[PDB]
Design a binder for this molecule. Structure first.
Ligand SMILES: NC(=O)C1=CN([C@@H]2O[C@H](COP(=O)(O)OP(=O)(O)OC[C@H]3O[C@@H](n4cnc5c(N)ncnc54)[C@H](OP(=O)(O)O)[C@@H]3O)[C@@H](O)[C@H]2O)C=CC1
Length: 416
C-alpha cells in the first residue's frame, strides 16, 4: 500500500477545518510540481473560470484543425496538464452543488424561501435519476467536505461523488481562499438519494459514483491504438463469408442494407440475399464483444429523430426547438433498425459537417460491436459498428455553438 506525501481520509465528511487544512498543504505541494506554463494557466483560470470551463466541455466536437487553431486551446491543454500531473493515489469523495436540470429533472425540488422538500418531489427526482448514467465533462471546482451553516449552498441538490483512484485533482489558492479543480470526463450513476438538513433547510444529497469507461474524444490516435490492440485479429476470427459481407457493407453495401432495415424490408419486401448479409454482419459483431465500457460518437441527421432538413424543429438556433427536442427525446429509448456507424472520436468530419446532432453513446462491456478500422480499406474514420436493432436510452441532451449553428449532444447509453 502507497504512503501519501500528505495523509488524508477518503472522505473528510463535515470536517471543513481538516479538509481546508489538507487542501492548503496539497495546493502548496502540487505548486512545486507545476510548470511555469501550467502555473500561468492556473492564473488565467482564476480570472476567466466560466469561459475556460465552457470550452473544456465542447472543445472535442469541432474539427481537428479548429481545435489546434482555437486561442483557448493552449490554456485548456496546460490546465489539463496541471490537473493530470496530480492523479490521486486513493479515492476521494468530493462535494458540489448541482442543478436538478443536469439530470433532466425539469421540476422545482424546493424554492429558495422553502425549507422543506416534499416526499413527492424527493421520489419524483429519485425516479428521474435511477438506473441512468450521466456524462460529466469540463473543468469544475469541487469541495472536499460537506457544506455547512457558513458555506455557500446555491441549489437544494448536493452531489456527493466518489472520484476513483488516479483521478486528476488540482488543489490551489485563489486570494485568501483555497479550491480544487477537476477536469471531469466520466459517467456518473446516482445510487442513493438522502434528504439531509443543512441550517434548518432540506437538501437532496445524491450519492454518486464514477462508472469507468474509455472516452478518447479528439485523441483519435489513442483510440486507434486501443481498437487495433483489441481488433487487429478480429478478421481471422470470422468465416470467409462473414468477412466478405462485413467488407462489402463497409465498402458501400451499407446503403442498400440499412435502407432495407429502416424500411422494415425483412417483413414488407424480403430480400434473402440481404438477409444473409445481415445475419453474417450481426454474428461477426458478436464474435468479439466490446471488452470495456466504451464511449462512441455519432454525427446524427434529422430522420434519425423523426425530422427532415426542411423541418422547423431542426433549427436549434431558436431555443424553443431545443426545449421541444429535449422534452420529446430525454428519458426516451431510441431504436435503430439498421447497423449503427459510430467513431471513437468526437471531432467533426467533412461528410457530416451540417449534422446538428451528436449522438454520444456509452457502450457497456460485453455489447456486440467491433472496431472495424483495424481492417484497412474503409471510408469511415475510427469506426466501431454497433449491431442492428440496438436501443439507446437518452439520459441528457445539451447544446453548443459550432460557429453560427447550434448543435446538440445526446448522452445515450446502449441498452442491453
Ligand atoms: N455518422 C457517423 O458519425 C459515422 C459515419 N461513418 C461513415 O459514414 C458513411 C455514411 O454513414 P452514415 O450517414 O452515418 O450512415 P447511415 O447508414 O446511418 O445513414 C445513411 C442515411 O440513412 C439515414 N439514417 C440513418 N440512421 C437512420 C435511422 N435510424 N432512421 C432513419 N434514417 C436513418 C440518414 O439520414 P439522417 O442523417 O437524416 O437520419 C442518412 O441519410 C459511411 O462510409 C460510414 O462508414 C463512420 C463512422 C462514424
Amino acid at each position: 500500500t502507497y504512503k501519501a506525501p500528505i495523509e488524508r481520509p477518503e472522505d473528510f465528511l463535515k470536517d471543513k477545518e481538516k479538509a481546508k487544512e489538507w487542501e492548503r498543504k496539497e495546493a502548496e505541494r502540487i505548486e512545486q510540481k507545476l510548470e511555469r506554463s501550467e502555473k500561468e494557466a492556473l492564473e488565467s483560470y482564476k480570472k476567466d473560470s466560466v469561459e475556460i470551463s465552457k470550452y473544456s466541455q465542447t472543445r472535442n466536437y469541432f474539427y481537428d484543425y479548429q481545435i489546434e487553431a482555437n486561442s483557448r486551446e493552449k490554456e485548456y491543454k496546460e490546465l489539463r496538464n496541471a490537473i493530470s500531473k496530480n492523479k490521486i493515489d486513493k479515492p476521494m469523495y468530493v462535494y458540489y452543488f448541482e442543478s436538478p436540470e443536469k439530470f433532466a429533472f425539469n421540476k422545482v425540488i424546493r424554492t429558495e424561501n422553502q425549507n422543506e422538500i416534499s416526499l413527492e418531489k424527493f421520489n419524483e427526482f429519485k425516479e428521474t435519476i435511477q438506473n441512468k448514467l450521466f456524462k460529466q465533462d469540463g473543468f469544475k471546482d469541487i469541495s472536499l467536505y460537506e457544506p455547512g451553516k457558513g458555506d455557500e449552498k446555491p441549489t437544494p441538490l448536493l452531489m456527493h461523488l466518489k472520484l476513483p483512484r488516479n483521478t486528476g485533482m488540482l488543489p490551489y489558492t485563489n486570494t485568501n481562499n483555497v479550491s480544487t479543480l477537476i477536469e471531469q470526463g466520466y459517467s456518473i450513476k446516482i445510487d442513493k438519494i438522502v434528504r439531509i438538513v443543512i441550517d434548518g433547510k432540506h437538501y437532496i444529497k445524491a450519492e454518486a459514483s464514477v462508472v469507468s469507461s474509455l472516452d478518447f474524444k479528439d485523441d483519435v490516435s489513442k483510440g486507434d491504438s486501443w481498437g487495433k490492440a483489441n481488433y487487429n485479429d478480429w478478421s481471422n476470427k470470422l468465416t470467409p463469408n462473414e468477412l466478405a459481407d462485413v467488407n462489402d457493407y463497409m465498402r458501400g453495401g451499407y446503403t442498400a442494407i440499412n435502407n432495407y432495415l429502416i424500411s422494415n424490408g425483412p417483413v414488407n419486401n424480403p430480400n434473402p440475399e440481404l438477409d444473409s448479409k445481415i445475419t453474417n454482419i450481426e454474428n461477426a459483431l458478436k464474435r468479439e464483444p466490446i471488452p470495456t465500457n466504451l464511449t462512441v460518437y455519432r454525427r446524427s441527421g434529422p430522420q434519425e429523430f423523426g425530422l427532415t432538413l426542411t423541418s422547423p424543429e431542426y433549427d436549434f438556433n431558436k431555443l424553443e426547438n431545443i426545449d421541444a427536442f429535449k422534452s420529446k427525446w430525454e428519458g426516451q429509448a431510441l431504436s435503430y433498425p439498421n447497423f449503427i456507424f459510430t467513431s471513437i472520436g468526437s471531432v467533426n468530419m467533412s461528410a457530416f459537417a451540417k449534422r446538428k446532432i451528436v449522438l454520444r453513446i456509452t457502450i457497456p462491456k460485453g455489447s456486440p460491436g467491433a472496431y472495424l478500422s483495424a481492417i484497412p480499406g474503409y471510408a469511415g474514420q475510427y469506426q466501431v459498428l454497433l449491431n442492428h436493432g440496438s436501443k439507446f436510452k437518452i439520459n441528457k441532451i445539451d447544446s453548443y455553438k459550432d460557429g453560427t449553428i447550434t448543435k446538440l449532444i445526446v448522452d445515450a447509453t446502449l441498452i442491453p
